[PDB]
Amino acid sequence: EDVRKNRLKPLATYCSVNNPEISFKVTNEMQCRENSIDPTKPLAERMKIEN
């Protein structure tokens, strides 16, 4: 359960509003959200599988 051992960590850090790669294009943020990694969410919540 360690945050550093979560296999979603590199994709979740990539899919962040703080990432220029995502920020610089309007569509990018939505492309992440549709792949179940929401950029506006905090890290641990961004990787959680709800319910």
Residues interacting with another protein, by CB under 8 A? 20, 23-27, 30
Select from 21, 13, 20, 10 the least CA-distant residue to 39. Answer: 13
Nearer to another protein, 23 or 36 (CB): 23
Q: How many CB atoms lie within 10 A of CB 12?
A: 21
Instruction: Give which of another protein, Cl ion, none residue 20 binds (C-beta under 5 to 8 Å, depending on kind).
Output: another protein
Tell me the C-alpha to C-alpha distance, in Å, between residue 9 and each of 26, 27, 50.
Answer: 23, 22, 16
Closest contact distance (angstroms) between CB of 13 and another protein is 20
Instruction: Give which of Cl ion, another protein, none residue 23 binds (C-beta under 5 to 8 Å, depending on kind).
Output: another protein
